[PDB]
Amino acid sequence: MLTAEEKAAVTAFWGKVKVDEVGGEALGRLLVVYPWTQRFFESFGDLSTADAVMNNPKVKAHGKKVLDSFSNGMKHLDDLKGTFAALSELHCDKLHVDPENFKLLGNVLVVVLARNFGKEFTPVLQADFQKVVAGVANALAHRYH
Amino acid sequence: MLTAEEKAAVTAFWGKVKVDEVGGEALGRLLVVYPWTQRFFESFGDLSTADAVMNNPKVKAHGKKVLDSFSNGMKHLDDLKGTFAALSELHCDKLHVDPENFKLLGNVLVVVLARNFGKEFTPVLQADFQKVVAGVANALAHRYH
Amino acid sequence: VLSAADKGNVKAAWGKVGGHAAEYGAEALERMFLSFPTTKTYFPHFDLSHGSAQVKGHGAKVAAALTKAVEHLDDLPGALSELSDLHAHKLRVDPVNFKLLSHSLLVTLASHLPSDFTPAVHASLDKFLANVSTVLTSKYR
Amino acid sequence: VLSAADKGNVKAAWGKVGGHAAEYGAEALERMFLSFPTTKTYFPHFDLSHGSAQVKGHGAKVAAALTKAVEHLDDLPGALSELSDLHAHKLRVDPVNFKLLSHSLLVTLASHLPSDFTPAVHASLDKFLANVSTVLTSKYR
Ligand code: HEM
Numbered sequence: 001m002l003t004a005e006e007k008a009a010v011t012a013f014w015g016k017v018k019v020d021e022v023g024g025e026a027l028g029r030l031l032v033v034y035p036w037t038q039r040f041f042e043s044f045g046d047l048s049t050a051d052a053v054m055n056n057p058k059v060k061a062h063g064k065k066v067l068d069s070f071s072n073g074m075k076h077l078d079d080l081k082g083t084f085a086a087l088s089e090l091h092c093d094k095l096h097v098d099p100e101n102f103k104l105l106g107n108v109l110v111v112v113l114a115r116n117f118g119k120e121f122t123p124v125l126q127a128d129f130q131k132v133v134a135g136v137a138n139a140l141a142h143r144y145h
Numbered sequence: 146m147l148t149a150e151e152k153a154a155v156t157a158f159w160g161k162v163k164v165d166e167v168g169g170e171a172l173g174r175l176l177v178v179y180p181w182t183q184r185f186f187e188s189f190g191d192l193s194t195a196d197a198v199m200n201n202p203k204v205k206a207h208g209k210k211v212l213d214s215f216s217n218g219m220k221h222l223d224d225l226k227g228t229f230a231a232l233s234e235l236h237c238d239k240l241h242v243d244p245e246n247f248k249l250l251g252n253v254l255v256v257v258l259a260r261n262f263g264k265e266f267t268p269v270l271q272a273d274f275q276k277v278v279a280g281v282a283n284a285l286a287h288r289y290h
Numbered sequence: 291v292l293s294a295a296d297k298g299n300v301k302a303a304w305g306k307v308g309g310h311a312a313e314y315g316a317e318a319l320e321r322m323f324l325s326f327p328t329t330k331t332y333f334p335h336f337d338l339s340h341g342s343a344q345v346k347g348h349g350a351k352v353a354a355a356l357t358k359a360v361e362h363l364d365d366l367p368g369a370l371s372e373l374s375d376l377h378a379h380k381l382r383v384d385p386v387n388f389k390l391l392s393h394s395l396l397v398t399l400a401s402h403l404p405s406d407f408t409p410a411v412h413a414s415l416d417k418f419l420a421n422v423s424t425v426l427t428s429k430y431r
Numbered sequence: 432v433l434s435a436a437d438k439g440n441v442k443a444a445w446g447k448v449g450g451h452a453a454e455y456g457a458e459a460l461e462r463m464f465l466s467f468p469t470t471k472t473y474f475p476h477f478d479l480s481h482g483s484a485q486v487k488g489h490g491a492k493v494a495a496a497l498t499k500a501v502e503h504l505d506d507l508p509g510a511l512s513e514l515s516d517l518h519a520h521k522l523r524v525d526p527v528n529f530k531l532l533s534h535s536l537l538v539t540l541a542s543h544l545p546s547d548f549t550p551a552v553h554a555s556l557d558k559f560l561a562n563v564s565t566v567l568t569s570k571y572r
C-alpha cells in the first residue's frame with residue numbers, strides 16, 4: 001500500500017482526528033445514507049429517523065469502536081490482512097455483511113473527515129486515505145476473496 | 146474454493162465443452178449486453194449491432210482465446226492466482242479493465258453454458274461453475290486488490 | 291423506460307415461458323440459494339432443501355409478480371408498489387441481492403429457452419430485470 | 432425519483448454553492464483524478480496537473496450541467512439527453528466511474544459546506560447524483 005511518505009502524511013493527520021466524534025458521525029451517516037445497513041443494527045434501537053440515528057447512544061458508541069479499529073490498522077498499515085482477521089471473521093463468516101458495504105463505510109468516513117477538516121483535507125491527503133480504506137475493505141472481505 | 150467432489154464434477158462436464166463455439170458466444174454477448182465493454186475492442190471493427198458483433202471474426206477469435214485461458218485454469222483449480230498472474234498484469238496494469246467486468250464475463254459464460262447444455266446444466270453444476278468464475282475473476286483482479 | 295423493441299422482446303420471451311412461469315421462479319430461487327449462499331440469510335424461517343414446498347410456493351409468488359410487471363411494462367413503479375415497500379422498507383434487502391436473483395433468472399430462462407434466448411432477447415431481459423430491481427430498491431425510506 | 436424532501440434539500444444545497452459551482456466542479460475532477468487514477472484514461476490529452484486550465488475549464492462544464500439538472504429535477508432525462516449520448520454512446524465510459532465522480536463531488540461539498548452538509552442533505556445529494564448517473568448511463572445503445 002502506502003509509501004513511507006504517504007504513510008507519514010496519513011499518520012500525522014490521523015492524530016488530529018477525534019475518534020469519539022468522527023466515529024459516531026461516520027456510523028450514523030452510513031445508516032442514514034444506505035438504509036439497508038440498518039438491518040444489521042436492529043438491536044441498537046430507534047433508527048427510524050435521521051435524528052433518531054444520529055442521536056442513538058448505541059450508534060455513537062459502536063461508531064467509536066469502529067474508528068478505534070481504524071486507528072489500529074493505521075498502526076499496522078503493512079499487514080491489514082492479519083490486523084483484520086478476527087473482524088473479517090465476524091463480518092463475513094458470522095454476520096454475512098456484503099463486502100460492498102465495507103467500501104461504503106470507508107467512503108463515508110472520507111466524507112466525514114472532509115466535513116470536519118475542510119481545507120486541511122487536501123486532494124492529495126484524500127488520495128492517501130482512499131488507499132487506506134481500500135486496504136481496510138479488502139482485509140475485511142478476505143474471508144470471501 | 147472447490148471441494149474435491151466439485152472439482153471432479155466440473156472437470157468431467159468441461160470435457161464436453163466446445164471451447165471455440167462457447168468462447169465466441171460468451172465474448173459476443175458481453176459486448177452486446179454490456180456495451181461500455183466495446184471500448185476495449187475498438188480495433189475489432191464493427192460492433193455496431195448484435196448481428197455485427199456475434200458474427201465478427203475477431204470477436205469469435207478472441208473469444209476462443211479467452212476460453213483457452215479458462216481451460217488452463219480448469220487444469221490448475223488450485224493456483225488460479227499463479228495461472229493468471231500474467232493475464233492480471235495485462236488486464237489491470239496495462240489495459241485498465243475495471244475488475245467488475247471480470248465478474249460480468251464470468252456470469253455471461255455461465256448463461257452461455259446454460260443455453261448450450263440445457264437440462265444437463267443443473268443448479269448444482271451451475272453452483273460449481275459460479276465458484277470457478279469467481280476464483281478466475283479474483284485472480285485477475287488481484288493486481289488491484 | 292424500456293424501448294418498444296425491448297418490451298416486445300420481454301413480452302415474447304415471457305410468452306414462451308407461459309405455463310412454466312411458476313416452475314422457473316422456483317428453479318431461479320434454488321439456483322440463487324445454491325450459487326450465492328448468503329441469500330439464504332433472508333429466509334431463516336424457510337425449509338431451503340431441494341424440492342421444499344416453501345421454496346416452490348415462494349417461486350410461484352415471484353413468477354406471479356414478474357408476470358404482473360410484464361403485463362404492466364409501462365408502470366412498473368405503479369405495478370410494483372407494495373413490493374418496493376416490503377423489500378426496501380420492511381425487509382431492507384441489500385441491493386446486491388437483486389443482481390444475484392436477476393442472474394439466476396437469466397440462467398433458468400437460457401436453460402429452458404435456448405432457441406429464443408438470443409443475444410437480443412438476453413439484452414432486453416437484462417434491462418427488464420434491472421428496471422424491476424430499481425423499482426424494488428427505490429423506497430428505502 | 433426524488434421525494435419532495437430530496438428535491439428541497441438539493442435545491443437548498445446547490446443554492447449555497449452559488450457562484451462557486453465552477454470551482455467545486457474543478458476540485459471534484461482533481462480529487463477524482465488523484466484518488467482514482469484509472470479515470471485519467473478518459474482524458475488522454477488533458478494536462479491533469481494541479482492548476483491545468485483544462486481541468487479548470489472542464490470543472491466549469493460539469494458544474495453547469497449539474498446546475499441545469501438541479502433546475503430540471505423533474506426531467507433529468509430530458510435535461511441530460513445530449514450528455515447520455517456523449518458519455519454512453521460516444522465515450523463508452525464504464526459505469527463504475529460515475530460512482531467515483533459522485534463520491535469526489537460529495538467530498539468537495541462536505542469540505543466547503545460543513546454546516547449545511549447534514550446527514551439528510553448528504554442522503555439527498557447522494558440520491559441526486561445517482562439519478563444523474565443513471566441518465567448519463569441510459570443510452571448504451
Ligand atoms: C471498515 C469497515 C468496518 C470496520 C473496521 C468495522 C469494525 C467493527 C468493529 C470494531 C466491531 C466490534 C466488535 C466487538 O464487539 O469488538 C464491529 C461489529 C459489527 N459490525 Fe462492523 N465494521 C465495518 C463495517 C461494517 C459494515 C459495513 C456493517 C454493516 C452494514 C457492519 C456491521 C457490524 C455489526 C452489526 C457489528 C456488531 C454489533 C454487535 O454484535 O453488537 N460493520 N465492526
Ligand code: HEM
Binds near residue numbers: 247281285
Ligand atoms: C474471465 C475474465 C477474462 C479472461 C480469462 C481474459 C483472458 C484474456 C486472454 C487469454 C487474452 C489474450 C492475450 C494474448 O493475446 O496473449 C485477453 C486479452 C484481452 N482482454 Fe481479456 N480476459 C477476461 C476479461 C476481459 C474483460 C472483461 C475485458 C474488457 C472489457 C478484457 C479485455 C481484453 C483485451 C482488450 C484484450 C487484448 C489484449 C491484447 O492482445 O492486447 N478481458 N484476455
Ligand code: HEM
Binds near residue numbers: 333351381391422
Ligand atoms: C426480481 C426481484 C424480486 C421479486 C419480483 C420478488 C417478489 C417477491 C414476492 C412476490 C414476495 C411475496 C410477498 C407476498 O406476496 O406476501 C416476496 C417476498 C420476499 N422476498 Fe422477494 N422478490 C425479488 C427479490 C428478492 C431478493 C433479491 C431477495 C433477497 C435475497 C428477496 C427476499 C424476499 C423475502 C425474504 C421475502 C419474504 C418471504 C416471506 O413471504 O416470508 N426478494 N418477494
Ligand code: HEM
Binds near residue numbers: 496524529
Ligand atoms: C455527474 C456526472 C457527470 C457529468 C455531469 C458530466 C458532465 C460532462 C460535460 C458537461 C461534458 C462536456 C460536454 C461538452 O459540452 O462538450 C463532459 C465531457 C466528458 N466527460 Fe463527463 N460528466 C460526468 C461524468 C463523467 C465521468 C464519470 C467520466 C469518466 C471518468 C466522464 C468523462 C468525460 C469525458 C472524457 C468527456 C469529454 C472531454 C473532452 O474530450 O473534451 N464524465 N462531461
